[PDB]
Structures are given as structure tokens and as C-alpha cells.
Amino acid sequence: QNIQEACLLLDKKQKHIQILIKGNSSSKSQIRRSSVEAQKYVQDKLLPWPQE
Amino acid sequence: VKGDYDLQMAHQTSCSSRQDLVCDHLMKQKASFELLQLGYELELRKHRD
Amino acid sequence: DKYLSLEEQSTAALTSFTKEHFFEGMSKFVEGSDENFQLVQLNVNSFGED
Amino acid sequence: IQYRCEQLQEIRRASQREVMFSAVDPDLSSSTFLEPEVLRDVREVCKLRFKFLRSLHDDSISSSVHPGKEDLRSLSHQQWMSMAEKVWNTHTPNHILAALERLTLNSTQELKKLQFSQAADLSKGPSCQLKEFSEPITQSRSCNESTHLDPQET
Numbered sequence: 001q002n003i004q005e006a007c008l009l010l011d012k013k014q015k016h017i018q019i020l021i022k023g024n025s026s027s028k029s030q031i032r033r034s035s036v037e038a039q040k041y042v043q044d045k046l047l048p049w050p051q052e
Numbered sequence: 053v054k055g056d057y058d059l060q061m062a063h064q065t066s067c068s069s070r071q072d073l074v075c076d077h078l079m080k081q082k083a084s085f086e087l088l089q090l091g092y093e094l095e096l097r098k099h100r101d
Numbered sequence: 102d103k104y105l106s107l108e109e110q111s112t113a114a115l116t117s118f119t120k121e122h123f124f125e126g127m128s129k130f131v132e133g134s135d136e137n138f139q140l141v142q143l144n145v146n147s148f149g150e151d
Numbered sequence: 152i153q154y155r156c157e158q159l160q161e162i163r164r165a166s167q168r169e170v171m172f173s174a175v176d177p178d179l180s181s182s183t184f185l186e187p188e189v190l191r192d193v194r195e196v197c198k199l200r201f202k203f204l205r206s207l208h209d210d211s212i213s214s215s216v217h218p219g220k221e222d223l224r225s226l227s228h229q230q231w232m233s234m235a236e237k238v239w240n241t242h243t244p245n246h247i248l249a250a251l252e253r254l255t256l257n258s259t260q261e262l263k264k265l266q267f268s269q270a271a272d273l274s275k276g277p278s279c280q281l282k283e284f285s286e287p288i289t290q291s292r293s294c295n296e297s298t299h300l301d302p303q304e305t
Contacts, residue, residue, distance in 0.1 A: 003057065006064040007131060012212055013071040020078035024112075027085035028105065034092035041099055053140075058302065063130065070122065073265070075208060076201075077115055080258060081108065083200035084251055087193070090235050091244065104248055107255045114262045121266070 166243040172253050175260060189242045193250040196235050203227045279305060 173184040203224070210220060238247065 003060050003064065003134065006061070006068065007134075009212070010064065010067055010071065013068065013075065016208065016211065017071065017074055017078065020075065020082065024078060024081050024085065027082065027089065028108070031085060031088050031092070034089060034096075038092055038096050038099070041096060046099060060130075060134075067123075067127070074115065074119060076205070077111075077258065077262065079204040079208065080197065080201050081111065081255075082204060083197045084108075084254065086200060087196060087235055087238075087247075088251070090232070091239055091247070094236060094239055104252050104255070107252055107259070111255050111259045111262070114259050114266075118262055118266055122269070 162243060166245050168246075170246050170249055172249070175257065177260070177264065187246075187250070189246040190250045190253060192238050192242065193247055194254060196231070196238050197254065199227075199231050199234060203231060 170187050170189060172187060172190060206220075206224070206227075210216070242250075
């Protein structure tokens with residue numbers, strides 16, 4: 001019975017590893033977007049003010 | 053039969069420990085990404101002020 | 102790009118570690134456990150080819 | 152405007168300081184190299200966030216949804232946000248990134264050490280030479296009578 005419960009625990013941990021791998025790939029993609037958003041805000045909104 | 057179940061239990065405990073090691077590494081990587089992401093949000097707020 | 106490349110190398114090292122010791126040996130060990138807890142009555146007839 | 156220019160010029164001067172991080176040779180014992188403050192502070196913020204993520208993971212595996220754990224999680228997240236914002240205000244972005252690169256390198260070397268230590272055990276055939284696994288940790292000497300079969304009978 002302990003051997004069966006340990007197999008179910010192994011499967012739950014395996015599902016969580018898959019969720020974490022997918023989450024870290026998404027987070028890496030989101031950091032890249034946030035870098036481009038900050039640069040674009042500086043170019044479109046801040047840099048024009050000295051001429052006015 | 054006794055000798056086989058002790059062997060299976062030892063094998064499962066080793067596999068469970070190795071899964072926790074993989075989880076802990078992925079969570080450390082996740083913690084570093086969320087720090088970087090907060091850095092960009094704070095920078096964008098200073099730019100708006 | 103330097104940081105994200107180091108993080109890819111970290112992820113590749115993790116992937117190597119996961120391949121070497123989860124795949125080649127684990128699948129065979131789980132299938133055999135479904136046999137009922139019959140105290141092996143050595144009944145001659147049913148033991149297969151092994 | 153002048154006060155804001157002074158603040159940004161101070162961040163620029165802080166960015167120009169090269170942060171020396173010590174070489175990770177594995178066999179070199181204990182020596183007294185002082186850890187860079189940025190590496191310590193980034194490590195503690197990442198470790199606090201890791202403990203928070205781990206507490207969320209342990210609670211997802213243990214089906215004991217104890218309801219009194221949500222308030223403690225919100226406090227842990229606010230404490231992380233405040234420390235992370237403090238780190239982003241005390242240290243330059245270049246130094247924070249270089250500290251993260253160093254932390255990722257250390258994590259990659261820990262994984263490689265774990266690969267080499269388990270490969271050396273498989274090449275020894277079944278000869279039971281129980282040699283000197285020395286140091287660690289525990290034996291909390293308290294416990295009672297019970298019969299537990301010393302099970303390292305081969």
C-alpha cells in the first residue's frame with residue numbers, strides 16, 4: 001500500500017515539474033517583452049519633450 | 053516477498069528525492085525571473101513620474 | 102542575452118540530468134505491481150516463458 | 152529637474168564600479184573571501200522568493216489545505232516586494248544582473264557535481280565495501296524503545 005501511494009506521489013511531482021518548466025519558459029518570454037516596452041516608452045513619450 | 057518490497061520502497065524514495073532536486077532548481081530559476089520582471093515594472097513607473 | 106544564455110545552459114544541464122536517470126530504467130518497474138497479493142501458490146501450470 | 156539629474160548621475164557613477172566576484176574552484180577549502188554586497192542581497196531576495204514558492208509547492212502536494220496559511224503568504228509576498236524594491240534602489244541594474252549571472256553559474260555547477268557523484272557508484276561491482284561516508288547530520292538521540300530491524304542486512 002505504501003508502494004502504491006509513493007507511485008501516486010511520483011506522478012503528482014512529475015505534473016508539477018511540467019507546470020514549472022512551462023511557467024519558466026513563459027517568464028523568460030515576458031522579461032523580453034518588458035524590456036522592449038520600457039525602451040519604446042522612452043522613445044515615444046520622453047525623448048520629444050526637450051523640443052517643446 | 054519481503055526482500056522485493058524493501059527494494060521497491062528504496063527505489064521509490066530515491067526517485068522522489070531526485071524529483072524534489074529538479075523542482076528546487078526550477079523554483080530558484082523562477083525566483084530570479086520574477087525579480088527581473090519587478091525591475092522592469094519599477095523602471096516604467098519612474099519614467100511615468 | 103548573456104544572462105538568458107547562462108540560464109539556457111543551466112536548463113540544458115538540468116535536462117541532461119533528467120534524461121540520464123528518469124527514462125531508460127523507470128517505465129519497466131511500475132507495470133508488474135498489479136498482480137494480486139496471492140501468496141505464490143506454486144501452481145505449476147501458469148508460470149510463463151521466463 | 153536638477154535633483155533628478157543628480158540622482159541619475161549618482162546611479163551612473165555607481166554602475167562604473169567593477170564588482171569582483173570570486174572564482175568557484177570546487178576543491179579549494181573555506182578561505183575568507185568577502186562576498187560582494189550585491190551578490191548577498193540578490194541571493195537573500197531570491198532565497199526569500201524561493202522559500203515562498205517552495206511553501207506554495209509543498210502545500211499543493213500535501214492535500215492539507217490548512218486555511219490559516221493565506222495571510223502568512225500575503226505577508227511573505229509584501230516582505231519580498233519591499234526587499235526586492237530596496238535591492239533595485241540600493242544596487243545598480245548592471246550589478247544586480249551580474250549577481251544573477253553568478254547565481255545561475257553556481258546553480259549550473261551544483262547540477263554538474265550531482266551528475267559526477269552518482270556515476271562513480273555504478274561502476275563498482277557488488278563488493279559491499281562499506282567505506283567511510285563520514286560527516287552528516289542528525290541523530291536526534293531522544294527516541295523510545297521500538298524494535299526497528301537494522302535493515303542494512305545485505
